From a paper:
Roseiflexus (R.) castenholzii is a chlorosome-less filamentous anoxygenic photosynthetic bacterium. Each LHαβ non-covalently bound two B880s and one B800 BChl on the periplasmic and cytoplasmic sides.
To investigate the LH-bound Car numbers and its correlation with the light intensities, we anaerobically cultured R. castenholzii cells under the light intensity (32 μmol m–2 s–1) used for obtaining the reported 4.1 Å RC-LH structure, and also a high and a low light intensity at 180 μmol m–2 s–1 and 2 μmol m–2 s–1, respectively. We here determined cryo-EM structures of native RC-LH (nRC-LH) complexes purified from R. castenholzii cells grown under high (180 μmol m–2 s–1), medium (32 μmol m–2 s–1), and low (2 μmol m–2 s–1) illuminations at 2.8 Å, 3.1 Å, and 2.9 Å resolutions, respectively. The nRC-LH complexes purified from cells under high, medium, and low illuminations showed the same Car absorption spectrum, indicating the pigments content was not affected by light intensities. Superposition of the high illumination model with that of medium and low illumination gave root mean square deviation of 1.753 Å and 1.765 Å, respectively, indicating these three structures share the same architecture, and light intensities did not affect the conformation of the nRC-LH structures. In particular, the LH ring bound 15 KγCint, 14 KγCext Cars, and an additional KγC that inserted between the LHαβ1 and c-TM in all three structures, indicating both Car compositions and assembly in the nRC-LH were not affected by light intensities. The low-pass filtered cryo-EM map of nRC-LH minus that of the reported 4.1 Å model showed apparent density differences for the KγCext, indicating the KγCext molecules were not resolved due to lack of clear EM densities in the 4.1 Å model.
Residue numbers in the entry:
A (entry chain 6), M (entry chain E), N (entry chain G), P (entry chain I): 7 to 55
B (entry chain L): 6 to 18, 29 to 315
C (entry chain Y): 1 to 32
D (entry chain Z): 12 to 58
E (entry chain C): 161 to 267
F (entry chain P), H (entry chain R), I (entry chain T), J (entry chain A), K (entry chain J), L (entry chain D), ...: 4 to 41
G (entry chain M): 335 to 640
The structure:
């Protein structure tokens, strides 16, 4: 686990850090797409009124 | 020398002493470990009458049985003139009477018969607990019998008091408590659609299937040269799983209790809170996941 | 009253359910 | 007039008496076999 | 009979405070029935819905009869034991099974 | 000895008591004697 | 002459699959065994699997056709869809439209083939291991009841409409309709006999389980070893049931009792259901002539009205 | 000795008590004596 | 000694309590004394 | 070898028989060929 | 010997008794003889 | 050998019997031949 | 297996050859009877029409 | 199994040959009776028409 | 030997008795003979 | 099994021969009685018509 | 030998008996021969 | 090797057969092509 | 370590899929957006 | 390694197939595209 930073060594293995990075990047991209979609949907038809 | 095996087979040629049944009974029969022996310091009846054990709860139970049988036969031969057991009609008091009893009015002997039957059942349960304590055993048989006794108690005590009329009790007549069952099932129409009745039916069917499979499994390896692993290999080729020697009995016990428990819950709930099991399911088509998704005869 | 006694009988009905849950808990716990 | 029809006789009571007698006979024979003497572990030393 | 009462039909009996737009068979009362089902007013009602021990019908006719019977249950709100003795359905005992016949003929 | 004395006594007494109870109930339920309010 | 190791780890047809066993964990803690092990697939179990798959596929596709192929209405109404048999008109005929009972017949036929091949699989696998063939005959009794319900009752009545309708809700409806159409099903004597045997089966199962679990400290659950020399647990159980009700069995006869109770339940149910339609058209009207119906002149009807 | 003294005493007392209770209830419910409000 | 003193005391006390309860409930339910609202 | 000969034979024969039966039933229930009384 | 004497006696006696009872009841319920009040 | 002779014989006989019964039942139930009262 | 022909020796036992012959003869007889029955049924009432 | 013919020695025991003979005679008698009964039934009332 | 004598005797006797009962019942229920009140 | 004939020695014990004789005689008597009963019933009321 | 003689005999006898019973019932229930009251 | 060849073959063949059957049934039931009597 | 990485991944992904399907179905059935034929 | 490759591929393929099927049935059943007879 020599690639894990010092703070998170007692929790993360060396193979799980890469998967965690992939998951974090995927979640951030999904959040960006979701905010864009919600803005477009509100511009189309407001659901609050 | 021929040794008779417990299965009844005799084989030519370990602690396999062929011993009578008297020695086993004499070794294990010791006095003074029942429930009442702990409470009063002594069991008033701590003896055996033939093969039966007569404890403090055996006398109460026998009194209850005798009184119940006498009161049952009095109402059905006298006060009805039927003279046949298949056409007598032992009914509780009318619903207009309320929760109070009256010796002058009809339906009085139904009350005494029901009370005596309840006393006898409770005494039987306590006597089983006593006998289980005397043998250093577990308390599982009393648990099962208590489940069925609670099933009895729900129908004749709790439901009538909750409804509040005391005429809400099934008559104690052969081929006539079926009449009460049929009329109660149709007043709350589609008793099939009661969710807890279906669970009871499912557990009953599973109990029958499990019992028959266990009997077949045990009988199939009775009197052959087997390595004690053949039945597991059979049960793993078919169905791809074997449960083990101790797992099956636990399953049987648990299912047998659960079926009657769910049935008593369903009957009690049908008595008081719901009036129509068809209207109970009216919420399914109205949840906010399917409301506007259909058209014509297909929309609800 | 109409509802208090009914709720009490409901409690009594569930007290019947409890003993078998006790056996399940004993079987689960006592193995280890 | 007061008698049940023949179907009521046979279909209902032949099975009933058959069930009662068969139960009472099976109980007797099973108790006989269970009370018969055969190989048992000695209770004095087994436990 | 007079035991039912002297109640008589009037304008508010059907219209119930609505001039037009009166609707029989709303969505509320069509709970466990097909939504296209209607009361079968093509038959002869003194003996129209008899199914018990017929040997010329099957579960299809019994299903139609059960739909009609559940509609009757919902319309009155008294359950299936209001007009029947569940030990024998063809029986004429409870005395509201005849009033229902007069209602069927009137409808 | 084919039959022990104790079982003979028990069976005879039980049968006698059962028959006595049954006969009294059958006679009382017949309503042909005017006994206990006719 | 029978090797248990090859019976579990052969390969291909007349062999097993999922050979490396899996462990469930929680089943070990609660039931005592958690190994899933390999499963046999040779010959029998292939035909049955294929036929059951075909029948289920037909039923599910006909479910899909009834809602316009909408997957949301499918989920909403999945528990009350059913494929019904042909109506009473020209009932026994097979020249029915696919949406008026055409899909029911093929699925029923495939189900019949599936159950028969499953019985054959049970028989052959019981023979191949050295154990007896009691399970095959018990399943034969169950199949007797099944075939009375699905094949032999519709036939001899003249129409396919007398059979169930292949649905979650369509079997309860079938039971209710069959009870209503032939008078009162409570007064059918074989129904009473079957109820007797079913309740006895449940009672016996509960008693046997409770006893074997109560005397489990002395290893009474090893029934195969108890059938050679009886240890203290079986003696304690025998004494318990002797002192309670005056008579008892041993570790061998109780299984005979259970087997025969189940078999009698199935057989009596089948006989009663078959007689329900062909010989006696009205069970209540027959019970009145047989003197088993109690007179009810003046019932108190306030109990049954809201 | 065929029968213990204790068994005889217990059986006789139980039978007597059961008979007394049954007879009192049967006479009370017959309404033929005018006792306890007719 | 055929019967322990403790057994006799227990049986007598149980019978007395049960019968006293039974007589009180039976007299109360008969409605012939004008007690506890008639 | 990936597959036995017997497995292939069994699977192919079963599939063929099932498809033949299904096709015959579907064509019979369509009523478009005027076969077996139209 | 294919069959015990005892089993033959038991089966024959049971069959005869059942047949006699069944025939008597079937004749009695027919009302074709005028026996026991027509 | 891929298949036993016994397995082939049993499978073929069962299939033939089932097919014969099915074909007879479908031909009879169609009512297009005037056999056994039309 | 000396009665089996050379080509089918690895498949057939000596006792199964006779049963196979019996089955073949029965099948051919049944086929002839089926052909006759079918032609008679067609001469009676055509089913294709 | 000295009574069985030479052909059927691999299939038949010595006690089963007699039983098979009895069975074949019974089958032939039953077939003759069935043919006669069918002819009489047809002469009474034809079922084909 | 393929079949025991006892099995053959049992099967034949059971089949015969079942058939005798069945044909007497079927002949009775038809009402085509006028026996036992028509 | 010295009482059984030569042909049926492989099939019969010495005790089963007598029982078989008894059963055969009973069957023949029953057949004669049944034939007489059928003749009487047909003379009474023909069932075919 | 692929099949026992006893197995063949049992299977053939059972099939024959079942077929005979089924055919007799099917012919009787059709009402096309005027046998046993038409 | 992450996957056996036989598992891949079985899964692919089963999926293809199921998809073909489903597509044929859906297209037949749509009533848009005029196949098998419209 | 309190929680495996695999467990958290599985729970979070399953929750996301279920919530997404639920939210699309609730938005589609509300009829407020004019999507897929109003 | 937190996840096997085969588990991931199986889960992804099954999810993709289910989603594609669901989307095609949803688009077909809405009747907003005029496909397969409107
Ligand atoms: C109502 C008005 C709009 C609308 C409004 C919105 C809005 C607003 C949003 C979406 C979003 C999305 N919509 Mg929408 N949507 C509409 C109609 C549609 C239609 C259609 C047929 O018309 C489709 C196909 C979709 C589909 C989609 C998705 C692309 C997306 C949600 C993804 C998801 O499930 O995340 C949840 C899924 C998961 C948690 C599972 C992920 C699985 C991963 C990627 C695969 C892993 C495989 C591997 C083996 C796993 C290993 C670990 C395992 C545990 C072993 N919408 C209409 C037209 N939609 C959202 C979005 O943009 O998301 C990015 C969003 O915010
Ligand atoms: C219907 C017109 C007549 C009438 C017509 C007849 C005729 C006709 C006869 C009788 C007969 C009898 N009737 Mg009457 N009967 C009438 C009204 C009555 C009434 C009544 C309440 O009105 C009663 C109580 C009786 C009573 C009796 C019995 C005295 C007797 C049958 C005995 C019996 O049970 O034999 C059956 C009993 C047994 C086989 C067993 C008896 C018990 C044994 C002796 C006890 C042994 C105990 C020992 C421990 C056992 C060892 C073995 C154990 C298993 C361990 N009758 C009316 C008035 N009655 C019959 C008779 O006279 O018999 C002599 C007779 O034939
Ligand atoms: C009122 C008129 C009623 C009627 C009402 C009753 C009632 C009520 C009873 C009887 C009882 C009996 N009846 Mg009367 N009986 C009637 C007509 C009859 C006829 C008839 C042919 O006409 C007969 C033959 C009988 C016959 C009998 C006997 C079976 C019995 C009394 C004798 C006995 O056993 O004493 C033996 C009895 C004893 C030895 C009891 C001794 C008890 C001791 C004294 C202690 C009592 C309890 C004590 C106070 C408790 C507190 C102290 C503590 C113990 C320390 N009755 C009419 C119809 N009959 C009584 C009986 O005992 O039934 C079982 C009974 O209860
Ligand atoms: C109201 C008029 C009612 C009626 C109402 C009752 C009621 C109510 C009861 C009786 C009881 C009895 N009735 Mg009265 N009874 C009526 C008419 C009759 C007739 C009749 C033919 O008319 C008869 C024969 C009887 C006969 C009897 C006796 C069996 C008994 C009383 C004597 C006894 O044994 O005392 C023996 C009793 C004792 C020695 C008890 C001693 C208890 C000690 C003193 C302790 C008491 C508890 C104490 C206060 C607790 C707190 C302190 C702590 C202990 C430290 N009754 C009428 C119909 N009767 C009573 C009884 O005891 O029944 C079993 C009873 O409860
Ligand atoms: C419908 C017009 C006629 C009629 C038409 C006919 C005709 C026609 C015939 C009969 C026949 C008979 N009928 Mg009829 N029958 C009528 C009315 C009746 C009435 C009546 C109450 O009126 C009765 C009692 C009978 C009775 C009889 C029998 C005597 C006989 C059938 C015997 C049998 O069971 O064979 C089957 C029995 C067995 C297979 C076994 C019987 C028992 C054996 C002998 C005992 C062995 C015991 C030993 C221990 C067993 C060892 C092996 C065990 C396995 C251990 N019929 C009416 C009046 N009936 C038949 C006959 O004459 O037969 C000779 C016959 O063909
Ligand atoms: C009446 C006209 C009907 C019709 C009615 C029937 C009926 C009815 C049957 C067939 C059967 C068959 N039909 Mg056709 N059939 C029709 C039109 C067709 C058409 C067509 C496209 O038009 C075709 C292709 C077929 C094709 C077929 C074959 C699959 C089969 C006959 C050959 C066979 O396999 O023999 C192989 C079969 C054998 C060799 C059997 C051998 C049996 C041996 C000889 C023993 C017989 C039993 C014996 C007597 C029992 C007693 C003795 C004891 C055994 C000791 N039919 C029309 C619609 N068809 C028959 C069949 O076998 O279906 C499975 C069948 O039962
Ligand atoms: C339930 C039946 C009884 C029984 C009842 C009888 C009877 C009854 C008789 C015998 C006789 C015999 N039994 Mg024994 N027997 C039983 C058990 C056994 C057992 C055994 C279980 O081990 C054995 C080995 C035997 C063996 C024997 C022989 C020792 C003996 C002579 C047989 C013979 O030659 O028959 C060969 C002859 C026949 C088989 C005759 C068959 C007749 C057929 C049935 C036709 C009858 C026509 C009818 C009478 C005419 C009717 C006219 C009407 C008016 C219409 N029985 C069982 C328990 N047994 C007989 C005997 O000892 O005679 C001196 C005798 O009478
Ligand atoms: C009435 C005209 C009816 C009809 C009514 C019947 C009836 C009824 C039956 C048959 C049966 C058969 N039918 Mg036809 N059948 C009709 C038209 C047809 C047609 C046609 C295309 O039209 C065909 C092909 C057939 C073909 C057949 C055969 C499958 C079979 C007869 C041959 C056989 O196997 O004998 C072989 C049979 C045997 C070898 C039996 C031998 C039995 C021995 C002799 C013992 C008999 C019992 C004995 C008396 C018991 C007492 C003694 C004790 C045992 C000691 N039927 C029409 C529709 N058919 C019969 C059959 O056996 O079906 C299975 C049958 O029962
Ligand atoms: C017609 C217009 C419809 C519509 C109809 C459809 C249909 C129909 C489908 C989609 C699918 C999808 N839709 Mg769209 N969709 C609409 C509006 C939207 C909106 C929107 C907000 O408006 C969004 C965000 C989406 C989003 C999406 C995605 C979730 C997805 C396509 C991307 C993907 O995952 O590719 C990844 C896809 C792949 C990598 C597939 C690879 C397949 C390989 C090539 C093999 C295919 C099988 C092969 C031919 C088999 C035979 C050979 C053998 C293998 C040997 N849709 C409207 C309402 N949409 C598609 C999908 O995949 O859903 C799960 C789909 O099926
Ligand atoms: C009372 C005697 C009575 C009156 C008054 C009345 C009026 C009435 C009107 C004016 C209409 C038509 C109004 C419009 O244009 O639709 C109308 C229509 C219906 N009615 Fe009616 N009506 C009276 C009595 C009754 C009674 C007693 C019934 C019930 C049996 C009844 C029923 C109906 C129905 C149904 C209609 C159809 C109206 C609809 O919206 O479809 N009326 N009535
Ligand atoms: Fe067991």
């Amino acid at each position: 686990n020599d690639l894990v930073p010092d703070q998170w060594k007692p929790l993360f293995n060396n193979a799980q850090w890469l998967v965690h990075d992939i998951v974090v990047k995927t979640i951030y991209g999904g959040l960006i797409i979701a905010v864009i979609a919600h803005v477009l949907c509100w511009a189309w038809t407001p659901w609050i009124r | 020398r021929a040794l008779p095996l417990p299965s009844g087979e005799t084989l030519p040629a370990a602690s396999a002493e062929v011993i009578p049944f008297s020695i086993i009974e004499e070794f294990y029969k010791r006095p003074g470990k029942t429930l009442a022996a702990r409470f009063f310091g002594v069991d008033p009846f701590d003896f055996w009458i033939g093969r039966f054990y007569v404890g403090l709860f055996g006398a109460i139970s026998i009194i209850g049985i005798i009184l119940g049988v006498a009161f049952y036969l009095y109402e059905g031969v006298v006060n009805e003139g039927t003279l046949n057991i298949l056409a007598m009609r032992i009914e509780p008091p009318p619903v207009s009477q309320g929760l109070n009893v009256d010796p002058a009015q009809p339906g009085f002997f139904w009350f005494l018969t029901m009370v005596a039957a309840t006393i006898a059942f409770v005494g039987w349960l306590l006597r089983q607990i006593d006998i289980s304590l005397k043998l250093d055993m577990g308390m599982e048989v009393p648990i099962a019998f208590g489940a069925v006794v609670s099933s009895w108690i729900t129908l004749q005590w709790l439901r009538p008091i909750a409804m509040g009329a005391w005429g809400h009790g099934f008559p104690l007549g052969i081929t006539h408590h079926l009449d009460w069952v049929s009329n109660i099932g149709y007043q709350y129409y589609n008793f099939f659609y009661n969710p807890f009745h279906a669970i009871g039916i499912t557990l009953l069917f599973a109990s029958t299937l499990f019992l028959h499979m266990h009997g077949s499994a045990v009988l199939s390896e009775a009197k052959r040269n087997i390595s004690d692993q053949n039945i597991h290999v059979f049960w793993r080729n078919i169905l791809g799983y074997s449960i083990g020697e101790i797992g099956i009995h636990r399953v049987a016990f648990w299912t047998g209790a659960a079926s009657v428990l769910f049935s008593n819950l369903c009957i009690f709930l049908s008595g008081t809170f719901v009036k129509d099991w068809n209207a109970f399911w009216g919420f399914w088509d109205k949840m906010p996941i399917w409301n506007g998704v259909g058209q014509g005869a297909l929309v609800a | 009253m109409n509802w208090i006694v009914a709720t009490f009988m409901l409690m009594f009905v569930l007290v019947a359910f409890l003993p078998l849950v006790v056996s399940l808990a004993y079987t689960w716990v006592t193995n280890p | 007039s007061p008698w049940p029809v023949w179907s009521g006789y046979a279909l209902c009571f032949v099975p009933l008496a058959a069930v009662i007698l068969g139960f009472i006979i099976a109980a007797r024979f099973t108790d006989k076999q269970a009370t018969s003497a055969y190989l048992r572990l000695d209770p004095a030393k087994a436990n | 009979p007079a035991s039912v009462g002297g109640y008589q039909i009037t304008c508010a009996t059907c219209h119930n405070g609505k001039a037009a737009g009166l609707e029989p068979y709303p969505i509320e009362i069509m709970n466990t029935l097909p939504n296209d089902w209607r009361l079968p007013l093509e038959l002869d009602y003194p003996g129209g819905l008899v199914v018990t021990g017929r040997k010329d019908v099957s579960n299809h006719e019994v299903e139609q009869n059960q739909f009609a019977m559940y509609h009757m249950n919902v319309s009155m709100g008294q359950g299936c034991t209001f007009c029947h003795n569940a030990r024998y359905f063809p029986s004429y005992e409870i005395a509201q099974k005849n009033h229902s016949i007069i209602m069927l003929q009137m409808t | 000895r084919p039959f022990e004395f104790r079982t003979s006594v028990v069976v005879s007494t039980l049968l006698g008591l059962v028959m006595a109870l049954l006969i009294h109930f059958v006679v009382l339920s017949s309503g042909a004697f005017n006994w206990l309010r006719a | 002459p029978i090797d248990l190791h090859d019976e579990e780890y052969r390969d291909g047809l007349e062999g097993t699959i999922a050979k490396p066993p899996g462990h469930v964990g929680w089943m070990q803690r609660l039931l005592g065994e958690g190994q899933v092990g390999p499963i046999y697939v040779g010959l029998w179990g292939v035909i049955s699997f294929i036929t059951f798959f075909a029948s289920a596929f037909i039923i599910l596709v006909d479910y899909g056709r009834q809602v316009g192929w909408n997957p949301i209405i499918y989920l909403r109404e999945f528990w009350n869809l059913a494929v019904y048999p042909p109506p009473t008109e020209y009932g026994l005929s097979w020249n029915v439209p696919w949406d008026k009972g055409g899909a029911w017949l093929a699925a029923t036929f495939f189900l019949h083939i599936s159950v028969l091949t499953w019985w054959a699989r049970l028989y052959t696998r019981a023979k191949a291991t050295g154990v007896g063939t009691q399970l095959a005959w018990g399943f034969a009794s169950a199949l007797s009841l099944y075939f009375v319900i699905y094949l032999f009752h519709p036939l001899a009545l003249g129409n396919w409409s007398a059979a169930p309708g292949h649905g979650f809700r369509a079997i309860l409806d079938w039971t209710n309709y069959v009870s209503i159409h032939w008078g009162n099903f409570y007064y059918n004597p074989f129904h009473m006999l079957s109820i007797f045997f079913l309740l006895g089966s449940t009672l016996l199962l509960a008693m046997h389980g409770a006893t074997i679990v109560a005397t489990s400290k002395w290893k009474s659950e090893m029934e195969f070893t108890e059938m050679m020399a009886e240890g203290p647990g079986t003696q304690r159980a025998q004494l318990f049931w002797r002192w309670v009700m005056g008579w008892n069995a041993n570790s061998y006869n109780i299984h005979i009792w259970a087997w025969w109770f189940a078999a009698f339940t199935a057989i009596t149910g089948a006989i009663g259901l078959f007689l329900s339609g062909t010989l006696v058209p009205d069970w209540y009207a027959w019970g009145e002539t047989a003197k088993i119906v109690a007179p009810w002149p003046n019932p108190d009807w306030a109990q049954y009205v809201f």
